[model samples]
Target: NSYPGCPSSYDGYCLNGGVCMHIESLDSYTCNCVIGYSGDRCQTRDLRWWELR
Candidate 1:
Protein backbone atom coordinates (compact mmCIF):
# COMPACT_ATOMS: atom_id res chain seq x y z
CA ASN A 1 0.00 0.00 0.00
CA SER A 2 1.79 3.01 -1.22
CA TYR A 3 0.70 6.25 0.37
CA PRO A 4 0.99 8.94 -2.21
CA GLY A 5 2.40 12.24 -0.93
CA CYS A 6 3.74 10.54 2.12
CA PRO A 7 7.04 11.96 3.27
CA SER A 8 9.41 9.52 1.59
CA SER A 9 12.21 11.80 0.51
CA TYR A 10 14.01 10.43 3.56
CA ASP A 11 13.61 7.26 5.53
CA GLY A 12 13.36 6.68 9.31
CA TYR A 13 11.32 9.78 9.80
CA CYS A 14 9.28 7.53 12.00
CA LEU A 15 10.56 5.29 14.73
CA ASN A 16 10.54 1.48 14.75
CA GLY A 17 9.87 1.15 11.05
CA GLY A 18 6.65 3.05 11.47
CA VAL A 19 4.74 4.38 8.48
CA CYS A 20 4.81 8.09 7.91
CA MET A 21 1.66 9.86 6.77
CA HIS A 22 1.05 13.54 6.34
CA ILE A 23 -1.99 15.38 7.52
CA GLU A 24 -0.86 18.37 5.51
CA SER A 25 1.95 18.46 2.98
CA LEU A 26 3.93 21.31 4.52
CA ASP A 27 2.68 21.16 8.08
CA SER A 28 2.02 17.75 9.60
CA TYR A 29 3.20 14.18 9.45
CA THR A 30 2.85 11.40 12.00
CA CYS A 31 3.70 7.78 12.42
CA ASN A 32 1.34 4.88 12.03
CA CYS A 33 2.93 2.10 14.00
CA VAL A 34 2.07 -1.40 15.07
CA ILE A 35 -0.34 -2.22 17.90
CA GLY A 36 2.45 -2.47 20.43
CA TYR A 37 3.38 1.19 19.93
CA SER A 38 1.65 4.53 20.06
CA GLY A 39 2.64 8.19 19.57
CA ASP A 40 2.91 10.85 16.94
CA ARG A 41 6.30 9.35 16.19
CA CYS A 42 5.82 5.84 17.62
CA GLN A 43 8.38 6.72 20.27
CA THR A 44 6.01 5.46 23.00
CA ARG A 45 5.05 1.88 23.61
CA ASP A 46 1.41 1.02 24.25
CA LEU A 47 1.58 -0.94 27.45
CA ARG A 48 -1.93 0.15 28.45
CA TRP A 49 -1.73 -1.32 31.95
CA TRP A 50 -4.75 0.75 32.87
CA GLU A 51 -6.84 -1.39 30.56
CA LEU A 52 -6.64 -4.14 33.14
CA ARG A 53 -8.16 -1.88 35.78
Candidate 2:
Protein backbone atom coordinates (compact mmCIF):
# COMPACT_ATOMS: atom_id res chain seq x y z
CA ASN A 1 0.00 0.00 0.00
CA SER A 2 3.02 2.29 0.15
CA TYR A 3 3.05 2.99 -3.59
CA PRO A 4 -0.65 2.81 -4.29
CA GLY A 5 0.17 0.29 -7.03
CA CYS A 6 3.14 -1.50 -5.51
CA PRO A 7 3.64 -3.46 -2.33
CA SER A 8 4.45 -1.48 0.82
CA SER A 9 7.67 -3.36 1.25
CA TYR A 10 9.69 -5.20 -1.35
CA ASP A 11 11.23 -7.85 0.93
CA GLY A 12 11.37 -10.86 -1.42
CA TYR A 13 11.36 -9.13 -4.79
CA CYS A 14 14.25 -6.70 -5.19
CA LEU A 15 16.77 -7.90 -7.78
CA ASN A 16 20.55 -7.29 -7.41
CA GLY A 17 19.90 -5.41 -4.17
CA GLY A 18 17.26 -3.34 -5.93
CA VAL A 19 14.07 -1.91 -4.44
CA CYS A 20 10.79 -1.14 -6.24
CA MET A 21 8.63 1.92 -5.62
CA HIS A 22 6.35 4.52 -7.13
CA ILE A 23 7.46 7.97 -8.26
CA GLU A 24 6.13 11.07 -9.95
CA SER A 25 6.48 11.77 -13.68
CA LEU A 26 5.89 9.32 -16.54
CA ASP A 27 2.34 9.08 -15.36
CA SER A 28 3.24 9.24 -11.69
CA TYR A 29 4.10 5.47 -11.67
CA THR A 30 7.09 3.24 -12.15
CA CYS A 31 9.30 0.75 -10.30
CA ASN A 32 12.93 1.75 -9.99
CA CYS A 33 15.89 -0.13 -8.53
CA VAL A 34 17.24 1.19 -5.25
CA ILE A 35 20.93 0.89 -6.01
CA GLY A 36 23.67 -1.20 -7.68
CA TYR A 37 21.31 -2.02 -10.47
CA SER A 38 20.93 0.77 -13.02
CA GLY A 39 19.94 0.22 -16.60
CA ASP A 40 16.90 0.90 -18.72
CA ARG A 41 15.16 2.33 -15.70
CA CYS A 42 17.29 0.25 -13.39
CA GLN A 43 16.48 -3.13 -14.82
CA THR A 44 20.04 -4.47 -14.91
CA ARG A 45 23.07 -4.84 -12.62
CA ASP A 46 25.74 -2.15 -12.74
CA LEU A 47 28.36 -3.59 -10.37
CA ARG A 48 29.72 -6.72 -8.73
CA TRP A 49 31.91 -7.63 -5.72
CA TRP A 50 34.69 -9.21 -7.80
CA GLU A 51 34.89 -6.10 -9.98
CA LEU A 52 35.42 -3.84 -6.96
CA ARG A 53 38.90 -5.18 -6.36
Candidate 3:
Protein backbone atom coordinates (compact mmCIF):
# COMPACT_ATOMS: atom_id res chain seq x y z
CA ASN A 1 0.00 0.00 0.00
CA SER A 2 1.02 3.61 -0.68
CA TYR A 3 -0.17 7.17 -0.19
CA PRO A 4 -0.46 10.00 -2.66
CA GLY A 5 2.75 11.93 -3.30
CA CYS A 6 3.46 15.52 -2.24
CA PRO A 7 3.96 18.72 -4.18
CA SER A 8 5.92 22.00 -4.16
CA SER A 9 6.42 25.22 -6.03
CA TYR A 10 9.07 25.46 -8.82
CA ASP A 11 9.26 21.67 -8.99
CA GLY A 12 10.03 21.24 -5.31
CA TYR A 13 11.81 24.59 -5.21
CA CYS A 14 15.11 23.91 -3.49
CA LEU A 15 17.31 26.91 -4.15
CA ASN A 16 21.13 27.04 -4.37
CA GLY A 17 21.14 23.80 -6.35
CA GLY A 18 19.41 21.77 -3.67
CA VAL A 19 17.16 18.80 -4.21
CA CYS A 20 13.75 18.47 -2.63
CA MET A 21 11.93 15.33 -1.69
CA HIS A 22 8.48 14.72 -0.27
CA ILE A 23 7.49 12.53 2.64
CA GLU A 24 4.02 11.20 2.14
CA SER A 25 3.25 9.95 5.65
CA LEU A 26 4.29 13.22 7.23
CA ASP A 27 3.01 15.37 4.40
CA SER A 28 6.31 17.19 4.57
CA TYR A 29 9.44 17.74 2.59
CA THR A 30 13.23 17.61 2.91
CA CYS A 31 15.93 19.43 1.03
CA ASN A 32 19.19 17.80 0.14
CA CYS A 33 21.52 20.71 -0.38
CA VAL A 34 24.65 20.98 -2.42
CA ILE A 35 27.98 22.18 -1.11
CA GLY A 36 27.74 25.62 0.54
CA TYR A 37 23.99 25.34 0.83
CA SER A 38 21.97 24.47 3.89
CA GLY A 39 18.48 24.83 5.29
CA ASP A 40 15.21 22.95 5.74
CA ARG A 41 14.15 24.95 2.73
CA CYS A 42 17.68 25.23 1.27
CA GLN A 43 17.59 28.99 1.74
CA THR A 44 20.83 29.55 3.59
CA ARG A 45 24.48 29.61 2.66
CA ASP A 46 25.76 30.91 5.97
CA LEU A 47 26.30 28.75 9.05
CA ARG A 48 23.06 27.66 10.62
CA TRP A 49 22.06 29.04 13.99
CA TRP A 50 22.79 25.73 15.67
CA GLU A 51 26.21 25.24 14.14
CA LEU A 52 29.25 26.00 16.28
CA ARG A 53 31.80 28.39 14.85
Candidate 4:
Protein backbone atom coordinates (compact mmCIF):
# COMPACT_ATOMS: atom_id res chain seq x y z
CA ASN A 1 0.00 0.00 0.00
CA SER A 2 1.00 3.55 -0.53
CA TYR A 3 2.29 5.69 2.30
CA PRO A 4 0.54 8.75 3.65
CA GLY A 5 -0.01 11.54 1.11
CA CYS A 6 0.63 9.23 -1.79
CA PRO A 7 -0.77 10.73 -4.99
CA SER A 8 -2.86 8.12 -6.77
CA SER A 9 -6.11 9.62 -7.96
CA TYR A 10 -5.12 12.70 -9.89
CA ASP A 11 -2.49 10.98 -11.94
CA GLY A 12 -3.13 7.46 -10.78
CA TYR A 13 0.45 7.32 -9.51
CA CYS A 14 -0.05 4.19 -7.49
CA LEU A 15 3.25 3.86 -5.73
CA ASN A 16 4.47 1.84 -2.76
CA GLY A 17 2.32 -1.15 -3.76
CA GLY A 18 -0.88 0.71 -4.67
CA VAL A 19 -2.51 -0.30 -7.91
CA CYS A 20 -3.57 2.35 -10.42
CA MET A 21 -6.96 1.90 -11.99
CA HIS A 22 -9.22 4.05 -14.13
CA ILE A 23 -12.93 4.66 -13.72
CA GLU A 24 -15.10 5.17 -16.76
CA SER A 25 -17.49 7.50 -15.01
CA LEU A 26 -14.87 10.14 -14.12
CA ASP A 27 -13.78 10.88 -17.67
CA SER A 28 -10.81 8.60 -17.10
CA TYR A 29 -8.77 11.50 -15.81
CA THR A 30 -9.71 10.96 -12.18
CA CYS A 31 -8.34 7.69 -10.82
CA ASN A 32 -9.42 5.08 -8.33
CA CYS A 33 -7.46 2.52 -6.35
CA VAL A 34 -7.30 -1.20 -5.79
CA ILE A 35 -9.24 -2.86 -2.98
CA GLY A 36 -6.46 -2.82 -0.42
CA TYR A 37 -5.35 0.76 -1.00
CA SER A 38 -8.23 3.17 -0.62
CA GLY A 39 -7.88 6.85 0.27
CA ASP A 40 -7.92 10.35 -1.12
CA ARG A 41 -4.93 9.53 -3.23
CA CYS A 42 -4.87 5.83 -2.57
CA GLN A 43 -2.76 6.54 0.49
CA THR A 44 -2.87 3.43 2.58
CA ARG A 45 -4.69 3.92 5.84
CA ASP A 46 -6.00 1.40 8.31
CA LEU A 47 -9.44 0.14 7.39
CA ARG A 48 -12.16 2.43 8.59
CA TRP A 49 -15.12 1.16 10.64
CA TRP A 50 -17.35 1.02 7.57
CA GLU A 51 -14.73 -0.60 5.37
CA LEU A 52 -14.26 -3.56 7.67
CA ARG A 53 -16.07 -6.80 6.93
Candidate 5:
Protein backbone atom coordinates (compact mmCIF):
# COMPACT_ATOMS: atom_id res chain seq x y z
CA ASN A 1 0.00 0.00 0.00
CA SER A 2 1.12 3.55 0.66
CA TYR A 3 4.23 4.46 2.62
CA PRO A 4 2.31 3.67 5.75
CA GLY A 5 1.19 7.24 5.48
CA CYS A 6 3.15 10.18 6.75
CA PRO A 7 6.31 9.63 8.73
CA SER A 8 5.50 8.38 12.17
CA SER A 9 8.73 9.73 13.63
CA TYR A 10 7.78 13.25 12.65
CA ASP A 11 5.56 15.33 14.90
CA GLY A 12 3.16 16.05 11.98
CA TYR A 13 4.38 19.61 12.09
CA CYS A 14 5.47 21.15 8.81
CA LEU A 15 7.58 24.13 9.71
CA ASN A 16 6.92 27.59 8.26
CA GLY A 17 3.52 26.75 6.81
CA GLY A 18 4.88 23.76 5.01
CA VAL A 19 2.35 21.18 3.92
CA CYS A 20 3.14 17.51 4.29
CA MET A 21 1.86 15.12 1.68
CA HIS A 22 2.21 11.41 1.23
CA ILE A 23 3.03 9.75 -2.09
CA GLU A 24 2.16 6.12 -2.19
CA SER A 25 4.36 5.45 -5.19
CA LEU A 26 7.35 7.14 -3.67
CA ASP A 27 6.60 5.39 -0.42
CA SER A 28 7.58 8.50 1.44
CA TYR A 29 6.29 11.82 2.62
CA THR A 30 7.28 15.16 1.15
CA CYS A 31 7.01 18.61 2.60
CA ASN A 32 5.50 21.28 0.38
CA CYS A 33 7.29 24.42 1.42
CA VAL A 34 6.06 27.94 0.92
CA ILE A 35 7.99 30.90 -0.41
CA GLY A 36 9.42 31.65 2.98
CA TYR A 37 10.94 28.26 3.71
CA SER A 38 11.88 25.20 1.66
CA GLY A 39 13.95 22.04 1.85
CA ASP A 40 13.58 18.36 2.48
CA ARG A 41 11.39 19.13 5.47
CA CYS A 42 10.66 22.69 4.52
CA GLN A 43 12.88 23.71 7.40
CA THR A 44 15.27 25.76 5.32
CA ARG A 45 14.93 29.49 5.76
CA ASP A 46 17.42 31.37 3.66
CA LEU A 47 17.53 35.14 3.74
CA ARG A 48 19.82 36.94 1.38
CA TRP A 49 19.99 39.94 3.64
CA TRP A 50 23.32 40.92 2.09
CA GLU A 51 21.53 41.44 -1.24
CA LEU A 52 18.50 43.06 0.29
CA ARG A 53 17.91 46.65 -0.69
Candidate 6:
Protein backbone atom coordinates (compact mmCIF):
# COMPACT_ATOMS: atom_id res chain seq x y z
CA ASN A 1 0.00 0.00 0.00
CA SER A 2 1.11 3.54 -0.74
CA TYR A 3 1.14 5.06 2.69
CA PRO A 4 1.04 8.79 2.28
CA GLY A 5 4.39 10.29 3.12
CA CYS A 6 6.79 13.00 2.14
CA PRO A 7 8.59 12.51 -1.11
CA SER A 8 12.33 12.86 -1.61
CA SER A 9 11.81 15.78 -3.99
CA TYR A 10 9.23 18.04 -5.58
CA ASP A 11 9.00 20.72 -8.26
CA GLY A 12 12.45 19.71 -9.51
CA TYR A 13 13.57 19.28 -5.92
CA CYS A 14 12.70 21.42 -2.94
CA LEU A 15 15.17 24.21 -2.64
CA ASN A 16 16.42 26.49 0.16
CA GLY A 17 16.25 23.70 2.70
CA GLY A 18 12.50 23.45 2.37
CA VAL A 19 10.82 20.56 4.15
CA CYS A 20 8.21 18.28 2.68
CA MET A 21 5.19 17.21 4.72
CA HIS A 22 2.78 14.43 4.01
CA ILE A 23 -0.92 14.36 4.75
CA GLU A 24 -2.24 10.84 4.81
CA SER A 25 -5.83 11.92 5.03
CA LEU A 26 -5.40 14.26 2.13
CA ASP A 27 -3.07 11.84 0.37
CA SER A 28 -0.79 14.68 -0.61
CA TYR A 29 2.33 16.49 0.36
CA THR A 30 3.39 20.13 0.60
CA CYS A 31 6.61 22.02 0.90
CA ASN A 32 7.23 24.16 3.97
CA CYS A 33 9.49 26.88 2.70
CA VAL A 34 12.25 28.27 4.83
CA ILE A 35 12.67 31.93 5.57
CA GLY A 36 13.93 34.16 2.76
CA TYR A 37 12.35 31.84 0.22
CA SER A 38 8.94 31.30 -1.29
CA GLY A 39 7.24 29.09 -3.94
CA ASP A 40 5.62 25.74 -4.33
CA ARG A 41 8.98 24.20 -3.44
CA CYS A 42 10.71 27.19 -1.96
CA GLN A 43 12.56 27.74 -5.21
CA THR A 44 12.13 31.52 -5.17
CA ARG A 45 14.80 33.39 -3.34
CA ASP A 46 13.63 36.45 -1.41
CA LEU A 47 16.38 38.79 -2.39
CA ARG A 48 16.37 42.41 -3.36
CA TRP A 49 17.69 43.41 -6.75
CA TRP A 50 20.20 45.61 -5.00
CA GLU A 51 21.65 42.55 -3.35
CA LEU A 52 22.76 41.35 -6.74
CA ARG A 53 24.31 44.71 -7.55
Question: How many residue pairs collide in each prediction?
Answer: 0, 0, 0, 0, 0, 0
- Every candidate's CA RMSD: 5.9, 5.5, 6.8, 9.5, 6.0, 6.0
Q: 1 in model 5: Cα distance from truth in Å?
A: 9.9
- Model 5 lDDT per residue over 1-52, tens place: 6553477776666876677778888667777777667766767767732235
Per-residue alpha-carbon lDDT of candidate 2 for residues 14-47, written as tens digits (9 for 90 to 100): 4564556655344344456654676665557766
What candidate 3 gets wrong by more than 4 Å, as runs, is: 1-12, 43-53
- Candidate 6 ranges with C-alpha deviation above 4 Å: 1-5, 8-12, 47-53
**Cα shift from native, residue 44, model 2 (Å):** 2.6
Point to the candidate with the largest lDDT: 5
Worst 10 residues of 4 by lDDT: 1-10
Q: TM-score winner between 1 and 3, please give it.
A: 3
Tens digits of per-residue lDDT, candidate 6, 1-53, equal 33544655554466776666677777687777765667766777777322564
User: Per-residue lDDT of 1-25 in model 4, one digit per residue for the tens?
Assistant: 2332423444436533454544444
lDDT of 3 by residue, 3-53 (tens): 333363546477665766666667676667766677666677665443565
What is the TM-score (0 to 1) of candidate 6?
0.54
Task: In candidate 6, list every pair of residues with a backbone clash.
Answer: none
Weakest 10 consecutive residues of candidate 3 by summed lDDT: 1-10
Task: Tell me the tens digit of each residue's lDDT in model 1 across 1-53.
Answer: 34444656656667654667766536566678776556667666656522455
Task: Using lDDT, rank the candidates from best to worst.
Answer: 5, 6, 3, 1, 2, 4
Positional deviation of residue 31's Cα in model 5 after best superposition, in angstroms:
0.9
Model 5 clash pairs are none
lDDT-wise, the better of 4 and 5 is: 5
